[PDB]
Design a protein around this motif. Structure first.
Motif, PDB file in Angstrom:
ATOM      1  N   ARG A  52       0.875  -1.121  -0.019  1.00  0.00           N
ATOM      2  CA  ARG A  52       0.064  -0.010   0.007  1.00  0.00           C
ATOM      3  C   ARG A  52       0.883   1.218   0.116  1.00  0.00           C
ATOM      4  NH1 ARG A  52      -3.217  -3.912   0.957  1.00  0.00           N
ATOM      5  NH2 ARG A  52      -5.473  -3.828   2.001  1.00  0.00           N
ATOM      6  N   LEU A  53       2.094   1.263   0.834  1.00  0.00           N
ATOM      7  CA  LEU A  53       2.792   2.546   0.913  1.00  0.00           C
ATOM      8  C   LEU A  53       3.708   2.553  -0.353  1.00  0.00           C
ATOM      9  CD1 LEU A  53       4.228   4.958   2.302  1.00  0.00           C
ATOM     10  CD2 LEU A  53       5.339   3.013   3.494  1.00  0.00           C
ATOM     11  N   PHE A  54       4.280   1.825  -1.062  1.00  0.00           N
ATOM     12  CA  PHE A  54       5.083   1.968  -2.034  1.00  0.00           C
ATOM     13  C   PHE A  54       4.342   1.680  -3.315  1.00  0.00           C
ATOM     14  CE2 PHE A  54       8.226   1.206   1.534  1.00  0.00           C
ATOM     15  CZ  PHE A  54       9.209   2.239   1.063  1.00  0.00           C
ATOM     16  N   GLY A  55       3.357   0.969  -3.404  1.00  0.00           N
ATOM     17  CA  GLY A  55       2.673   0.772  -4.785  1.00  0.00           C
ATOM     18  C   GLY A  55       3.149  -0.329  -5.527  1.00  0.00           C
ATOM     19  N   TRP A  56       3.838  -1.314  -4.907  1.00  0.00           N
ATOM     20  CA  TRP A  56       4.392  -2.653  -5.598  1.00  0.00           C
ATOM     21  C   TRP A  56       3.647  -3.764  -4.810  1.00  0.00           C
ATOM     22  CZ3 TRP A  56       7.945  -2.156  -9.634  1.00  0.00           C
ATOM     23  CH2 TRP A  56       8.473  -0.797  -9.908  1.00  0.00           C
ATOM     24  N   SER A  57       3.360  -4.753  -5.578  1.00  0.00           N
ATOM     25  CA  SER A  57       2.599  -5.860  -4.760  1.00  0.00           C
ATOM     26  C   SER A  57       4.271  -6.868  -4.579  1.00  0.00           C
ATOM     27  CB  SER A  57       1.979  -6.583  -6.124  1.00  0.00           C
ATOM     28  OG  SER A  57       2.839  -7.424  -6.964  1.00  0.00           O
ATOM     29  N   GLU A  58       3.696  -7.717  -3.626  1.00  0.00           N
ATOM     30  CA  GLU A  58       4.775  -8.655  -3.231  1.00  0.00           C
ATOM     31  C   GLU A  58       5.309  -9.318  -4.464  1.00  0.00           C
ATOM     32  OE1 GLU A  58       3.307 -11.036  -0.294  1.00  0.00           O
ATOM     33  OE2 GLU A  58       1.849 -12.332  -1.759  1.00  0.00           O
ATOM     34  N   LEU A  59       4.799  -9.880  -5.433  1.00  0.00           N
ATOM     35  CA  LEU A  59       5.117 -10.565  -6.396  1.00  0.00           C
ATOM     36  C   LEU A  59       5.989  -9.724  -7.241  1.00  0.00           C
ATOM     37  CD1 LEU A  59       3.841 -13.180  -5.446  1.00  0.00           C
ATOM     38  CD2 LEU A  59       2.254 -12.723  -7.392  1.00  0.00           C
ATOM     39  N   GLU A  60       5.754  -8.339  -7.298  1.00  0.00           N
ATOM     40  CA  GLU A  60       6.443  -7.482  -8.110  1.00  0.00           C
ATOM     41  C   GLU A  60       7.505  -6.985  -7.523  1.00  0.00           C
ATOM     42  OE1 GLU A  60       3.113  -4.593  -8.523  1.00  0.00           O
ATOM     43  OE2 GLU A  60       3.134  -4.917 -10.546  1.00  0.00           O
ATOM     44  N   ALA A  61       7.648  -6.958  -6.239  1.00  0.00           N
ATOM     45  CA  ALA A  61       8.783  -6.419  -5.542  1.00  0.00           C
ATOM     46  C   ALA A  61       9.784  -7.513  -5.045  1.00  0.00           C
ATOM     47  CB  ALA A  61       8.279  -5.768  -3.983  1.00  0.00           C
ATOM     48  N   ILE A  62       9.334  -8.768  -4.753  1.00  0.00           N
ATOM     49  CA  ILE A  62      10.215  -9.858  -4.231  1.00  0.00           C
ATOM     50  C   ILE A  62      11.070 -10.095  -5.533  1.00  0.00           C
ATOM     51  CG2 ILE A  62      10.677 -12.030  -3.232  1.00  0.00           C
ATOM     52  CD1 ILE A  62       8.136 -11.916  -1.804  1.00  0.00           C
ATOM     53  N   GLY A  63      12.645 -10.099  -5.247  1.00  0.00           N
ATOM     54  CA  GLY A  63      13.750 -10.312  -6.226  1.00  0.00           C
ATOM     55  C   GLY A  63      14.350  -9.366  -6.769  1.00  0.00           C
ATOM     56  N   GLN A  64      13.756  -8.052  -6.556  1.00  0.00           N
ATOM     57  CA  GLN A  64      14.074  -6.772  -6.987  1.00  0.00           C
ATOM     58  C   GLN A  64      14.964  -6.176  -5.980  1.00  0.00           C
ATOM     59  OE1 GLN A  64      11.937  -4.352  -9.728  1.00  0.00           O
ATOM     60  NE2 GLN A  64      13.525  -5.822 -10.201  1.00  0.00           N
ATOM     61  N   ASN A  65      15.829  -5.375  -6.276  1.00  0.00           N
ATOM     62  CA  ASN A  65      16.704  -4.665  -5.255  1.00  0.00           C
ATOM     63  C   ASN A  65      15.915  -3.431  -4.447  1.00  0.00           C
ATOM     64  OD1 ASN A  65      18.689  -2.577  -4.509  1.00  0.00           O
ATOM     65  ND2 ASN A  65      20.172  -3.857  -5.087  1.00  0.00           N
ATOM     66  N   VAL A  66      16.278  -3.337  -3.407  1.00  0.00           N
ATOM     67  CA  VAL A  66      15.554  -2.562  -2.561  1.00  0.00           C
ATOM     68  C   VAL A  66      15.667  -1.007  -2.866  1.00  0.00           C
ATOM     69  CG1 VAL A  66      17.177  -2.117  -0.561  1.00  0.00           C
ATOM     70  CG2 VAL A  66      14.492  -2.076   0.006  1.00  0.00           C
ATOM     71  N   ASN A  67      16.566  -0.695  -3.714  1.00  0.00           N
ATOM     72  CA  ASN A  67      16.849   0.608  -4.129  1.00  0.00           C
ATOM     73  C   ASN A  67      15.611   1.071  -4.984  1.00  0.00           C
ATOM     74  OD1 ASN A  67      17.204  -0.567  -6.810  1.00  0.00           O
ATOM     75  ND2 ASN A  67      19.427  -0.141  -6.734  1.00  0.00           N
ATOM     76  N   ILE A  68      14.778   0.325  -5.699  1.00  0.00           N
ATOM     77  CA  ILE A  68      13.684   0.600  -6.539  1.00  0.00           C
ATOM     78  C   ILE A  68      12.692   1.241  -5.521  1.00  0.00           C
ATOM     79  CG2 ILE A  68      14.016  -1.487  -7.834  1.00  0.00           C
ATOM     80  CD1 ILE A  68      11.126  -2.524  -6.528  1.00  0.00           C
ATOM     81  N   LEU A  69      12.808   1.332  -4.317  1.00  0.00           N
ATOM     82  CA  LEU A  69      11.889   2.082  -3.354  1.00  0.00           C
ATOM     83  C   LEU A  69      12.449   3.499  -2.689  1.00  0.00           C
ATOM     84  CD1 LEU A  69      10.881  -0.589  -0.762  1.00  0.00           C
ATOM     85  CD2 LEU A  69       9.995  -0.101  -3.139  1.00  0.00           C
ATOM     86  N   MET A  70      13.513   3.931  -3.621  1.00  0.00           N
ATOM     87  CA  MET A  70      14.333   5.090  -3.179  1.00  0.00           C
ATOM     88  C   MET A  70      14.612   5.751  -4.385  1.00  0.00           C
ATOM     89  SD  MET A  70      17.501   3.311  -1.443  1.00  0.00           S
ATOM     90  CE  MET A  70      16.494   2.107  -0.985  1.00  0.00           C
ATOM     91  N   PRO A  71      14.637   7.336  -4.446  1.00  0.00           N
ATOM     92  CA  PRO A  71      14.911   8.137  -5.511  1.00  0.00           C
ATOM     93  C   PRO A  71      16.478   8.350  -5.637  1.00  0.00           C
ATOM     94  CG  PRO A  71      14.381   9.598  -3.753  1.00  0.00           C
ATOM     95  CD  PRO A  71      14.450   8.150  -3.186  1.00  0.00           C
ATOM     96  N   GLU A  72      16.935   8.924  -6.575  1.00  0.00           N
ATOM     97  CA  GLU A  72      18.353   9.088  -6.391  1.00  0.00           C
ATOM     98  C   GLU A  72      18.680  10.355  -5.571  1.00  0.00           C
ATOM     99  OE1 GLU A  72      20.486   7.579  -7.886  1.00  0.00           O
ATOM    100  OE2 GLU A  72      19.658   6.481  -9.607  1.00  0.00           O
ATOM    101  N   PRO A  73      20.048  10.475  -5.145  1.00  0.00           N
ATOM    102  CA  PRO A  73      21.230   9.806  -5.336  1.00  0.00           C
ATOM    103  C   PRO A  73      21.277   8.420  -4.635  1.00  0.00           C
ATOM    104  CG  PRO A  73      21.794  11.321  -3.937  1.00  0.00           C
ATOM    105  CD  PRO A  73      20.187  11.701  -4.410  1.00  0.00           C
ATOM    106  N   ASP A  74      20.246   8.127  -3.662  1.00  0.00           N
ATOM    107  CA  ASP A  74      20.337   7.178  -2.589  1.00  0.00           C
ATOM    108  C   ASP A  74      20.246   5.945  -3.479  1.00  0.00           C
ATOM    109  OD1 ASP A  74      20.716   8.635  -0.253  1.00  0.00           O
ATOM    110  OD2 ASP A  74      18.515   8.343   0.387  1.00  0.00           O
ATOM    111  N   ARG A  75      19.263   5.870  -4.506  1.00  0.00           N
ATOM    112  CA  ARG A  75      19.108   4.668  -5.220  1.00  0.00           C
ATOM    113  C   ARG A  75      20.387   4.060  -5.922  1.00  0.00           C
ATOM    114  NH1 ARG A  75      17.779   2.241 -10.314  1.00  0.00           N
ATOM    115  NH2 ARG A  75      16.078   1.298 -10.344  1.00  0.00           N
ATOM    116  N   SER A  76      21.158   4.808  -6.423  1.00  0.00           N
ATOM    117  CA  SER A  76      22.464   4.496  -7.117  1.00  0.00           C
ATOM    118  C   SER A  76      23.589   4.145  -6.054  1.00  0.00           C
ATOM    119  CB  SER A  76      22.907   5.148  -8.174  1.00  0.00           C
ATOM    120  OG  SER A  76      21.932   5.144  -9.225  1.00  0.00           O
TER     121      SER A  76
END
Ligand code: HEM
Ligand code: HEM
Lengths: 253, 250
Positions: free
Chosen positions: A153-177
């Motif tokens: 609900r907070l981030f907008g991604w479902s579990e199936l969509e988020a699991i396996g991805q890098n946690v950086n997809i939840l933050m903007p730049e420059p923190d992401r990189s």
């Protein structure tokens, strides 16, 4: 023959004769003086289990890659004896298969452990669904492993969509990189770092919008790899009521 | 049969195993069985344990069961539980030791899964910012997180086994057991998930406003509730100071 702790049995497809070991008699919870019999064996198992055993012998009667079935007996008033019956096929000659022989194993400890894991798995589901704060679990490389309902609900991604991805997809730049490097830096210093020091950072939703959030992290170790459990707290409402309060306070001062 | 068979007679020190038994140990079909080869598949720690185990069965005779992992196919290993008993040649002479080799890769995989879950649970209980409480179908506390210890003033050892009602003031303290049973018997549109603000009481006797989120689960025929407590003392002081500044200006 002595000690062992495992029972043995023998049964012939033709003439249905059965011979079990002495240690196997104790496993079935009966047999102080009664002789072994196929009917007696099926008389100790519960009705649903009895059917499973019969299908198993029929399965191994025609081809059959072994024999292994588990069932529980009514040995004691408030407890059951879990037994894993394993057996193998041995034919007389090229003609037919005439006698299946095997062993009886006590799987009470194996079943208690299996049940314990089931309880833990069920609880994790409950926690992930119930917890009000977004809970995220990553691995030593920042790969999301668990993503709770609140995180969705907070981030907008479902579990199936988020699991396996890098946690950086939840933050903007420059923190992401630079996040990946933040994790590797902590894995080398190994000192009493920000783990347990709630600092406010800003996360980004799939949507693209950003928000102020507070995070609490707990580390654990398993199989040679570390895992981090995060607890996100959205501070959007807090920072706005704190701003309106500090603004309605400056209308006179 | 996916089980292996083997016998190591004390007399003549020989050792013969079945076909499935050699496959489990990761031994070539052409290679011949021998006691020397068997101990060469185990690692030094495990090897020592098996040898001391065989020395103990001979000088006792109470069975023998040891678990070890061989380096079957490089990357991973094969977990094997070797169980055996001793047959006696005469009245006072123990000669053969016969037994089986069991594949326990799945059994060991479950043990590891449980261990990770237990370690993660401890991590959650220690790290969760909100007080997390877990109770059984009769209100008895099962788990008490670090935040719950600080908010309610009870230690986890003190709280576990107590009725959750020790954290509440009256009248909820006396009617809480009834709210639980009236829910279990008439489970339908209750307040399990809807969290209204309630009043909690610390060991002090002091009280504070709180909002609670509950989650239900089943295990072994019994229900379990997991609660997450959010202290509203700060939130109420803040918004009370909002109306104490928005209505004072008339
Ligand atoms: C969603 C937005 C997030 C942002 C913007 C963010 C940002 C950051 C920043 C800025 C640091 C370094 C702090 C410093 O050097 O002063 C850091 C470190 C770290 N973060 Fe994140 N983070 C986020 C979420 C998470 C989550 C959910 C986890 C774990 C479940 C996590 C795991 C870590 C770890 C393990 C470190 C290094 C250890 C430490 O310094 O405490 N991050 N992150
Ligand atoms: C510590 C402060 C608590 C207070 C003051 C409190 C009080 C209450 C109240 C007022 C109700 C609803 C009665 C009604 O519907 O008329 C209720 C129900 C219930 N509470 Fe509590 N409670 C507390 C903590 C907890 C905790 C920590 C748990 C479990 C982890 C829990 C589990 C339940 C259950 C299972 C019910 C019945 C189902 C329902 O109606 O939602 N309570 N309690």
């Amino acid at each position: 023959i002595e000690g062992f702790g495992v029972g043995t049995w023998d049964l012939d497809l033709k003439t249905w004769a059965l011979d079990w070991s002495d240690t196997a008699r104790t496993l079935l919870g009966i047999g102080q003086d009664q002789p072994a019999s196929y009917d007696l064996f099926l008389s100790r198992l519960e009705p649903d289990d009895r059917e499973r055993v019969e299908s198993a012998i029929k399965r191994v009667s025609e081809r059959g890659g072994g024999f292994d079935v588990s069932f529980r007996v009514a040995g004691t008033s408030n407890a059951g004896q879990w037994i894993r019956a394993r057996a193998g096929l041995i034919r007389d000659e090229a003609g037919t298969a005439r006698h299946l022989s095997g062993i009886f194993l006590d799987i009470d400890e194996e079943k208690q452990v299996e049940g314990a894991l089931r309880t833990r798995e069920t609880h994790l589901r409950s926690i992930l669904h119930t917890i009000p704060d977004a809970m995220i679990v990553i691995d030593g490389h920042g790969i999301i492993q668990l993503f709770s309902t609140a995180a969705e609900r907070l981030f907008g991604w479902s579990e199936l969509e988020a699991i396996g991805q890098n946690v950086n997809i939840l933050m903007p730049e420059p923190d992401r990189s630079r996040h990946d490097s933040y994790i590797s830096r902590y894995r080398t210093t190994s000192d009493p770092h920000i783990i347990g020091i709630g600092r406010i950072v800003t996360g980004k939703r799939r949507d693209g919008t950003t928000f102020p959030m507070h995070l609490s992290i707990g580390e654990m170790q398993s199989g040679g790899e570390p895992y981090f459990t995060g607890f996100v707290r959205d501070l959007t409402e807090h920072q706005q009521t704190q701003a309106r309060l500090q603004e309605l306070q400056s209308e006179l001062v």
